C-alpha cells in the first residue's frame, strides 16, 4: 500500500529503514500466516517488501 | 560571537532539469512488438493500403 | 520542468500559440551542529591505579 | 558507557553544559564451594556378602 505511492516509478524504493519491533510484528504475522504464503523455513525473511530489505 | 558575524549560505544552480514523470519505454521489444516505433516518413495526411476482402 | 512542452498543431491553420517560460526550483540542505559535554579526565585517578593517562 | 556523550549544541548560544566524568563498571565471579556428605563404606558390610570393598 505504501508502494502504491511513486506510481510506476515505485521500484526505485530500495530499502525500508524500520525499527526492530515492526520486524517482530511482521514475524508474528508470518508465524500465524492467515493464507498459505509462509512455512516453518520461510517465516524468517528480512526482505519482505517485494524483495526490498 | 557567531551572531555578531555575517553568515553566508552556499548558493548554486544544478545544470540539470526534470524531463518526465511517466515510463514511456513501450515500443517494439519493450512491448514484445505490440507497439511498433519505426522512422517511416510518408507524404500526405493518409497512408492507406487496400487488401482483398 | 516545462509542463506543456508538446502541443497539438494544425498544419492547415495559422493561429497564435501561448508562450511558455523557464522556471527554476531550489533544493535545500540544512546544517546540524553536535558537541560533547565536558569530560573530567584528571591524570591523578589513572596514575593512582597505574593507568597511562 | 559515557551516557549522552553526543548532545545537540547551539552555535549561537553560550549556555553552560554540566560535566561528564569518566568511570568504569566492575563484574564479579563468585566462588561456589561444594562437597560430598560422609559416605559410610564398612568393609564388614561387603565382607559379609563376600564382595571386595
Cell numbers placing D18: 554540566
| Pairwise CA distance, residues B13 & C25, whole Å | 10
Q: Considering only CB atoms, which chain B residues are within 8 Å of A8?
A: 22-23
B30, β-bridge pairs: none
| Pairwise CA distance, residues B26 & B38, whole Å | 13
Nearest to C35 among D2, D7, D21 (CB): D7
* Residue D7 near residue C34, CB atoms below 8 Å: yes
* Residue D9 near residue C34, CB atoms below 8 Å: yes
Question: What burial letters (b/e) apply to D9-47, b meaning 16+ CB within 10 Å?
Answer: eeeeeeeeeeebeeeeeeeeeeeeeeeeeeeeeeeeeee
Residue from D10, D12, D14, D15 whose CB has the most chain B CBs within 10 Å, to mutate? D12
Helices (H), chain D: 43-48
* Residue A43 near residue A31, CB atoms below 8 Å: yes
- How many beta carbons lie within 10 A of that of residue C16, not counting itself? 5
- How many beta carbons lie within 10 A of that of residue A3, not counting itself? 13
What does residue C34 show for φ and ψ, rounded to 5 degrees?
Answer: -135, 145
Helix, strand, coil % in chain A, rounded to nearest 5: 25, 5, 75
For chain D, say whether B46 makes contact (Cβ under 8 Å). Answer: no
| Pairwise CA distance, residues D51 & C52, whole Å | 68
Q: Considering only CB atoms, which chain C residues are within 8 Å of B12?
A: none
Closest chain B residue by Cα to residue A11: B23
**Chain C from 1 to 53: CB within 8 A of any D CB:** 33-41
User: Among candidates A44, A52, A42, which has minimal Cα distance to A13?
Assistant: A52
What element of type H or E holds C49? none
DSSP B29: G
Distance from CA of D12 to the nearest CA of B (A): 6
| Cell 530499502 found at | A15
Are B13 and C1 inside 8 Å of each other by CB? no
Residue from A5, A6, A9, A11 whose CB has the most chain B CBs within 10 Å, to mutate? A9
Please, is C37 exposed, middle or buried when counting C-beta atoms within 10 Å of its C-beta (0-12, 13-18, 19+)? middle
Resolution (A): 2.9
User: What is the experimental method?
Assistant: cryo-EM
Distance from CA of B11 to the nearest CA of A (A): 29
Amino acid at each position: 500500500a505504501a508502494q502504491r505511492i511513486f506510481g510506476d516509478r515505485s521500484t526505485d524504493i530500495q530499502v525500508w529503514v524500520s525499527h526492530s519491533s515492526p520486524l517482530f510484528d511482521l514475524y508474528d504475522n508470518a508465524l500465524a500466516n492467515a493464507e498459505q504464503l509462509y512455512v516453518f523455513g520461510t517465516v524468517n525473511v528480512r526482505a519482505d517488501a517485494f524483495g526490498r530489505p | 560571537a557567531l551572531s555578531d558575524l555575517q553568515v553566508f549560505n552556499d548558493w548554486a544552480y544544478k545544470t540539470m532539469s526534470e524531463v518526465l514523470d511517466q515510463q514511456v519505454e513501450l515500443f517494439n521489444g519493450a512491448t514484445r512488438g505490440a507497439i511498433i516505433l519505426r522512422s517511416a516518413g510518408n507524404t500526405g495526411d493518409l497512408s492507406e493500403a487496400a487488401f482483398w476482402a | 520542468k516545462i509542463q506543456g512542452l508538446v502541443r497539438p498543431r494544425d498544419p492547415y491553420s495559422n493561429a497564435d500559440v501561448a508562450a511558455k517560460d523557464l522556471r527554476q526550483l531550489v533544493d535545500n540542505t540544512i546544517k546540524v551542529a553536535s558537541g560533547t559535554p565536558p569530560i573530567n579526565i584528571p591524570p591523578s585517578m589513572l596514575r593512582w591505579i597505574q593507568k597511562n593517562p
